[PDB]
Amino acid sequence: QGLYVGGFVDVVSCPKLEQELYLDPDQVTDYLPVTEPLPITIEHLPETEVGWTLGLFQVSHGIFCTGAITSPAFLELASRLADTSHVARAPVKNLPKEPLLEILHTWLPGLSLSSIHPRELTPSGPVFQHVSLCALGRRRGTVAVYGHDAEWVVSRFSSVSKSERAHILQHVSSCRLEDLSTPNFVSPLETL
Numbered sequence: 795q796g797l798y799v800g801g802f803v804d805v806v807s808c809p810k811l812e813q814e815l816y817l818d819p820d821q822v823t824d825y826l827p828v829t830e831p832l833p834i835t836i837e838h839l840p841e842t843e844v845g846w847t848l849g850l851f852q853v854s855h856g857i858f859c860t861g862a863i864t865s866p867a868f869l870e871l872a873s874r875l876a877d878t879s880h881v882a883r884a885p886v887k888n889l890p891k892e893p894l895l896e897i898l899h900t901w902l903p904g905l906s907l908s909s910i911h912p913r914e915l916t917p918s919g920p921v922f923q924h925v926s927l928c929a930l931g932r933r934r935g936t937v938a939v940y941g942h943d944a945e946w947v948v949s950r951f952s953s954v955s956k957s958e959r960a961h962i963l964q965h966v967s968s969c970r971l972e973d974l975s976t977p978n979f980v981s982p983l984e985t986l
C-alpha cells in the first residue's frame with residue numbers, strides 16, 4: 795500500500811504490434827537515466843496504469859528499473875486474488891508468507907520498457923513512453939522482484955553493486971509518491 799517493483803528491462807519498440815522490435819540496451823544508454831516518472835502498465839495496455847517508475851538507470855549488466863505500484867484498485871484486487879484465487883496460487887509455491895509478492899513475482903516476471911524505433915536514434919521527442927509488467931516477452935530482462943521496501947527490492951539483485959544500489963536508491967528516495975496522480979486502472983470486479 796503501495797508496493798515497489800525492481801528489475802532489468804527489455805527495450806521494445808512498438809510492443810505487441812506487427813512491427814515489434816526488441817532494442818539492444820546500448821542503443822538507448824545515451825538517453826539514460828530517466829528520473830521523471832513514466833506510467834507503469836500491464837502488457838502495454840494503456841488503460842491498466844498501476845503505478846509510476848522512480849528511475850531507469852544504466853548499470854554494468856543492463857538497464858535497471860525501479861517503480862512504485864500505487865493504484866489502490868490494483869493492490870486491493872491483487873491481494874484479494876492472492877488470498878482467494880486458486881488459479882492465481884496454482885503456479886506459486888504452496889503457503890507463501892507473502893502471497894501478493896509471490897503472485898506478482900510469478901505472473902508478471904517481465905519488465906518491458908517501451909521505446910521509439912532505433913532509426914530515430916538526435917530524437918525530437920521523448921525516447922521512452924512507459925514500462926509494462928509482462929507475462930510474456932522477457933528476453934534480456936530478469937524476473938521482476940516486488941517488495942514493500944525499495945532497498946529490499948534492489949538488494950535482491952546480485953548483479954547490482956552497492957554503489958549502483960546507492961545511486962538508484964538515491965533517486966528513489968528523491969521521489970515523493972503521494973504527489974503523483976492516481977493511475978487509471980479500474981478493477982474489473984467493480985466494472986464488469
Ligand SMILES: CS(=O)(=O)NC(=O)c1ccc(NC(=O)c2cccc(CC3CCCCC3)n2)c(Cc2ccccc2)c1
Nearest residue numbers: 836868871872875882897898901902929982983984985986
Ligand atoms: C471480474 S472480471 O471482469 O470477470 N475479471 C476479468 O475479466 C479479468 C480478466 C483477466 C485478468 N487477468 C489476466 O488475464 C492476467 C494474465 C496474466 C497476468 C495477469 C497479471 C496478474 C494476474 C493475477 C494477479 C494480478 C494480476 N493477469 C483478470 C485479473 C486481473 C487482476 C489484476 C489486474 C488485471 C487483471 C481479470
